[PDB]
Design a protein around this ligand. Structure first.
Ligand SMILES: CCCCCCCC/C=C\CCCCCCCC(=O)O[C@@H](COC(=O)CCCCCCCCCCCCCCC)COP(=O)([O-])OCC[N+](C)(C)C
Ligand SMILES: CCCCCCCC/C=C\CCCCCCCC(=O)O[C@@H](COC(=O)CCCCCCCCCCCCCCC)COP(=O)([O-])OCC[N+](C)(C)C
Ligand SMILES: CCCCCCCCCCCCCCCCCCCC(=O)O[C@H](COC(=O)CCCCCCCCCCCCCC)COP(=O)(O)OCCN
Ligand SMILES: CCCCCCCCCCCCCCCCCCCC(=O)O[C@H](COC(=O)CCCCCCCCCCCCCC)COP(=O)(O)OCCN
Ligand SMILES: CC(C)CCC[C@@H](C)[C@H]1CC[C@H]2[C@@H]3CC=C4C[C@@H](OC(=O)CCC(=O)O)CC[C@]4(C)[C@H]3CC[C@]12C
Ligand SMILES: CC(C)CCC[C@@H](C)[C@H]1CC[C@H]2[C@@H]3CC=C4C[C@@H](OC(=O)CCC(=O)O)CC[C@]4(C)[C@H]3CC[C@]12C
Ligand SMILES: Cn1c(=O)n(CCCO)c(=O)c2c1nc(Oc1cccc(Cl)c1)n2Cc1ccc(Cl)cc1
Ligand SMILES: Cn1c(=O)n(CCCO)c(=O)c2c1nc(Oc1cccc(Cl)c1)n2Cc1ccc(Cl)cc1
Ligand SMILES: [Ca+2]
Ligand SMILES: [Ca+2]
Ligand SMILES: [Zn+2]
Ligand SMILES: [Zn+2]
Lengths: 668, 51, 668
């Protein structure tokens, strides 16, 4: 048997103290009033007594939404400490106003204040009631603040400090508290969400709560935008300056839902097709023919802009869709010339051919455009693209190609056959660099999948799965290096000279593979190519009759195969499946954000000419304020409607019925 | 509206068919509001199936 | 503009007919009574008038659970047609009893009867009330009935006949209607679920409804078993004869949930470990050592059973777990001898060796056991196993091996080297058949994964994914045959003799592959081996300088590769993923059903000795009835509790409040 008793005992209620609490719970006004009047004379009942759940009479009255009994208790001067917090959490309008007009256990932490709790509940009525007075919320310090107060509070009590900061940010991120008491709710939501995301990054713990607060602020901004009812209002909102200034601010703060708003996208599309008014309703063949015709005429449009920008053709290229088509056509012609560039080879450092002479201005235009973007946009914007890295690599490789071509031209004159050229001859290195540059240039077309409806979200999904690929890369590389070390340690004794080989060819790229694991570099390459099955098995064989050594090397190779293919590759497939399922829900919003960035990149005057042709306030604030007031009214009404459209509800219904019953019985 | 088609419509089935077809075409044409037109068309199709 | 009007018009209510209906809806008893009394004198209000929704006054009263107004309307002799059906569907006790004691539009089909609708609602109170009278439900005919009435009804109105049959089976499959008015609820549920599954198979349409009705019956049987509270009751239930007779009947009807009942499994486990009382609580090492010791002593136990079955060792093998261990050990020794059988080869038809002489009695025992199982169990039970197919194949291959060995022994005496033997020499065919038999025998161990907790559900999952594999097999084979036909048609002109080959070797199994597509059989094999990458590319090359033909053949081969690998194999992976996710929820129940079948296979006296040693009522009904009565009471109480633990509820609350309000106002 296990005896069961009360380990942590408390003070039990008296027989009367229990009858009085039961009367309060049942809502019988007459008996509660009689008990209150009798307590003043006889002092037999403690009006502040708790219950087995810790609730006093006032807390019971508040929880039952019994305003009459509550007010009766207040008129008898019962203990009221922290009752306002319970009234605010209960989200009952009557309790606050009643209570507003006037160390025990508490369900609320000491740092909770009435306005902070009201902001936590996100109840517009109670928040407005509290803001009607003079209430304040403490300002949180910097995310990486190092003042004496912050470090002192962190060292004295880290839990209390973290809880207080989280409560403050929960209060500030309240959509209702931003709807009121905020000059610019949209900008406030943007910057508050950004700061909450930064806190989520910094705070390893409480990361989920800061993430959800930031997401809540983002959704509040998106809903405020949703309340717009006319194009005039939407233009006023997006063009406000603290064109499309506020849209640019939203893009800066990574407000993807706000940018992907259907009305925002519709306005951006009307700006995107400046020239064509009816591009929305056209057939596939008509659109394709128009795109082909505009692309084939890109040199004409560029020349017209160069000569006279003010004409039917001079300013026709400044239109965003037309400019995009011209740049894409220019890049396509550049790639076509790159393909044609491989259609006498014994000359050491030959002069550039006609195709190379045509290619050169495109490379110069690419470099000039990159440096112009760096000079104009800035440094942080240039490095935030993450596509400028490939552009920088292409430009550097092209510059190295040109330098090596010049070196080979001015250092060699004779025509020696390539068979006897040096391994590190300048022409060979230049050609290798040019080939790598061609690969990168042709691969640069991936960034244009954003402009397409069918290819955009797919590109987003593949880009976000590249992160899982990168994560798997580390473990694969560790395994690869481990087995490379083992195989090299085992096999480096039997290294053979190239002369001994049947065709004077040494390594794994010969017709008969040999010396697969003789050196660490060759071992790494061999383990790489065994992933694709191009490494033959006999490479695990040695000329000496060391069958144990051969078997051990073969077993190492087989274990590497088993891991890298059976275990690691299937785990990679599983990770990709999970990540793609996770990111399939938000593909459209991310794609629309990326496409908005692409479209806005073509809104600027600078960079109008594609290569190689590039080398040749009070009233506005008042309008914004009135639009914001209308949006806030509409948002508040809509959210109240949505919330209107628990066991405590049934408890309140029972309380109302019982109070009515007791009143009727007393009257009769 | 399924109720507004149940009333004030000579042939509710044909009305639902053609209205759903037109809503699908609008969903194609209207790049934005695509989900709403898709759900309206699906609602008309379900109304025909329930009839 | 689109004019909107009422296409299908109706008869509008009068001003009074609307006020009277509104009074009925609000529950005002006094005004309804006054209107009813005034209608008898003035005949100004039609008491049977409908509303815009088609409901009459009685239907409104029933829908609001207003028994007083309902009874008032009944006392005034209002139209009552089909009101009982609405009362039953509403699941209100008062309406039925009231109505029970006493071609317009209807929400119920003409074939619906009060008892049928009550059974559809599965409401025990109303079903019991209706069964208290003399009510009947029509008997559905055979699933494949061909009588004149069935075909006449099907031809006259297929929709009506199908609807009537489905309604009847919905009525009969009611758990409450089976709890009452059924001699044996468990057997009734088993056979009714089986018949519903058969109907689901036969009825291509309405398949989902019959499937869910069958599943509902299965769950009802499982819940009835769940209500058992002691081992005596469970034994009485499982041992009832219309041992473990009812358990066998459940297994016959594929009642997987009933068999996988935790109490059923616990009883089956206590039977399974007859010898060991405390096998449940033992360490892994102890269990493994005990299993090894029992397995290594299987010949001793078999001999002891053969000599004296009545001894500490004679009857120790009749225990189910011990018998299973002995049979498994016997099969393992047989496989060990098969492995040893490959440790002078020029003799044509040699006498069997010592290992073959030891193998022979095991084969004879296998054949004798198979034919004994066929003779005892029957034919349908033998073919329902689906594992007896592999056993039959093994036995046939072994018999063919023995026949060919005898033929080669009695037809050849000389010792000729194998190099110059005939292609179809009897010894070679016998050896090939024996090797195939060895493969099948070793693969037969898959069926023992059922006995294991970790390997059982995995085997179930793999077996159920074999169905998706089989489905994909048809499309793969169609593609394979198509491309084989194309490649053979293209390449059969350049067929070359084996002499012309460098090593006199023709086909794809040579060191230098040749004639890959010369014949249809070889083309099929080549397309098979290209799936695994073992077909080299140069097989698409011909000696003649027909570069167009070579390119076309290479393109056909490449398209076959693309389909079969990129498209078909990934689609197979996707199908397997979906099927495995689908069947992962029910893996445990299916595994427990399979393991119960395996355990019960070792409960019988027959087949006790493994190879090769096999070749050397009223009171029971009363107890079952009382147990079933207790189970039905408990099940009814539990299901009512579960159901107790809609907008119509709020409508009823409003109706009650309004009726109380009107009564109080009238009284005051
Ligand atoms: C993006 C990077 C841009 C810059 C590229 C790097 C600079 C290229 C410039 C190269 C010019 C180097 C001098 C060449 C002079 C030739 C004569 C000579 O002195 O040979 C010397 C050796 O020469 C070498 O070792 C060359 C090594 C080239 C490595 C290139 C790595 C990057 C290419 C892959 C990039 C992948 C990018 C993937 C994305 C002496 O040899 P020896 O003593 O006679 O013996
Ligand atoms: C389960 C099935 C059981 C029965 C097996 C089949 C019976 C086996 C019995 C075979 C004995 C046949 C007679 C042999 C006589 C030898 C001399 C002779 O006359 O050769 C003759 C030809 O002989 C043949 O063509 C043999 C063909 C064997 C095909 C086996 C297919 C099944 C094996 C795979 C099973 C996979 C199972 C996968 C699961 C004449 O040749 P010729 O004119 O000289 O030229
Ligand atoms: C020594 C000899 C060396 C020879 C080397 C020969 C091979 C040449 C190197 C090939 C590098 C391939 C780089 C692929 C670019 C990455 C990329 O496209 O990201 C896409 C998503 O982009 C985005 O979402 C935006 C971010 C873009 C990042 C681009 C980074 C490029 C870095 C180049 C270095 C993926 O999209 P998807 O193709 O999966 O669809
Ligand atoms: C001419 C020369 C021919 C040479 C042929 C050489 C190869 C020999 C043939 C190999 C056949 C493999 C049969 C595999 C048995 C099927 C099986 O084990 O089903 C398991 C599930 O079983 C179950 O769930 C119960 C059903 C069992 C059906 C067994 C059917 C065997 C038919 C044999 C014919 C799968 O389970 P898992 O292994 O995926 O796990
Ligand atoms: C696919 C293989 C054969 C290589 C093809 C090389 C190029 C000819 C292809 C590859 C990617 C294609 C581009 C992919 C993305 C688009 C988006 C597309 O924009 C639209 O979808 C119309 C709606 C809009 O963008 O406003 C314009 C065509 C373009 C630039 C394509 C032009 C032709 C490209 C450059
Ligand atoms: C795995 C490779 C090395 C081939 C092994 C051949 C056999 C030695 C293995 C393969 C499958 C094994 C069997 C798989 C299933 C079981 C279930 C197992 O039963 C239990 O799990 C204990 C609980 C119970 O069954 O009552 C008894 C061992 C046995 C027969 C195993 C015995 C050893 C087997 C036959
Ligand atoms: C990692 N690996 C490997 O490198 N080689 C190459 C060796 C050089 O030829 C294997 O051949 C191999 C293998 N794994 C295997 O199958 C298992 C699966 C589970 C456990 C164990 Cl121990 C083995 N094999 C097959 C094999 C089974 C039994 C025997 Cl006796 C000998 C070979
Ligand atoms: C089905 N198939 C195939 O059988 N062979 C073997 C031919 C015999 O050597 C291919 O080489 C092949 C291929 N598919 C491909 O890539 C696409 C992808 C989409 C559309 C098209 Cl048209 C081609 N290639 C590569 C290739 C691309 C362009 C050119 Cl010009 C020539 C070869
Ligand atoms: Ca750039
Ligand atoms: Ca069998
Ligand atoms: Zn600070
Ligand atoms: Zn019939």
């Amino acid at each position: 048997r296990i005896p069961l008793q009360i380990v942590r005992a408390e003070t039990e209620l008296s027989a009367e103290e229990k009858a009085f609490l039961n009367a309060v719970e049942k809502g019988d006004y007459a008996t509660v009033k009689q008990a209150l009047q009798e307590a003043e004379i006889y002092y037999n009942v403690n009006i502040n007594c708790m219950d087995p759940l810790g609730r006093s009479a006032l807390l019971i009255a508040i929880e039952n939404e019994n305003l009459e009994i509550m007010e009766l208790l207040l008129n008898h001067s019962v203990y009221v400490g922290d009752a306002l917090l319970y009234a605010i959490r209960k989200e009952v309008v009557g309790a606050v106003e009643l209570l507003l007009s006037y160390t025990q256990f508490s369900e609320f932490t000491p740092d909770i204040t009435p306005i902070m709790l009201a902001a936590h509940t996100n109840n517009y009525e109670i928040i407005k009631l509290l803001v009607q007075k003079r209430v304040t919320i403490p300002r949180p310090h910097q995310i990486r603040c190092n003042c004496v107060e912050c470090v002192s509070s962190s060292e004295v009590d880290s839990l209390r400090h973290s809880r207080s900061r989280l409560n403050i940010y929960k209060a500030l991120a309240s959509p209702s508290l931003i709807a009121l008491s905020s000059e610019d709710p949209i900008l406030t939501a943007f910057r508050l969400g950004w700061e909450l995301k930064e806190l989520s990054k910094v705070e390893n713990e409480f990361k989920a709560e800061y993430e959800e607060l930031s997401q809540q602020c983002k959704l509040f901004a998106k809903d405020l935008l949703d309340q717009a009812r006319s194009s005039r209002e939407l233009e006023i909102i997006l063009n406000h300056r603290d064109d499309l200034a506020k849209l640019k601010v939203a893009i800066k703060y990574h407000q993807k839902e706000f940018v992907a708003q259907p009305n925002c996208q519709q306005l951006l599309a009307t700006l995107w097709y400046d020239g064509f008014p009816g591009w929305r309703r056209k057939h596939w063949v008509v659109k394709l023919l128009t795109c082909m015709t505009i692309g084939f005429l890109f040199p004409m449009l560029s020349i017209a802009y160069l000569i006279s920008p003010r004409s039917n053709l001079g300013l026709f290229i400044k239109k965003p869709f037309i400019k995009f088509i011209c740049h894409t056509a220019s890049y396509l012609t550049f790639l076509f010339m790159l393909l044609l560039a491989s259609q006498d080879l014994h000359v050491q450092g030959p002069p550039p051919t006609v195709v190379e002479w045509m290619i050169l201005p495109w490379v110069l235009g690419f470099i000039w455009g990159e440096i112009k973007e760096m000079w104009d946009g800035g440094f942080t914007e240039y490095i935030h693209d993450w596509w400028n890295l490939m552009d920088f690599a292409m430009n550097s490789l092209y510059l190295a190609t040109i330098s090596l071509k010049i070196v080979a031209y001015v250092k060699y004159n004779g025509s020696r056959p390539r068979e006897e050229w040096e391994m590190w001859h300048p022409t060979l290195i230049a050609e290798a660099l040019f080939a790598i540059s061609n690969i990168l240039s042709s691969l640069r077309l991936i960034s244009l999948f954003t402009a397409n409806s069918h290819l955009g979200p797919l590109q987003i999904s593949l880009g976000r799965m590249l992160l899982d690929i990168l994560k798997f890369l580390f473990i694969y590389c560790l395994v690869l290096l481990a087995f490379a070390n083992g195989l090299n340690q085992l096999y480096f004794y039997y290294e053979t000279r190239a002369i001994d080989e049947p065709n004077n060819c040494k390594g794994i790229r010969c017709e008969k593979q040999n010396n697969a694991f003789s050196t660490l570099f060759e071992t790494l390459q061999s383990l790489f190519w065994s992933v694709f099955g191009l490494l033959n098995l006999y490479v695990t064989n040695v000329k000496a009759r060391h069958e144990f050594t051969e078997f051990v090397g073969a077993t190492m190779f087989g274990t590497y195969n088993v891991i890298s293919l059976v275990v690691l590759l299937n785990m990679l497939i599983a990770m990709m499946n999970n990540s793609y399922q996770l990111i399939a829900d938000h593909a459209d919003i991310e794609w629309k954000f990326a496409r908005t960035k692409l479209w806005m990149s073509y809104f600027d005057e600078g960079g109008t000419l594609p290569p190689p042709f590039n080398i040749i306030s009070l009233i506005q604030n008042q309008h914004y304020q009135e639009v914001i007031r209308n949006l806030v009214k509409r948002y508040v009404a809509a959210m109240i409607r949505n919330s209107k459209t628990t066991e405590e509800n049934f408890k309140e219904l029972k309380q109302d019925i019982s109070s009515f019953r007791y009143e009727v019985l007393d009257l009769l």
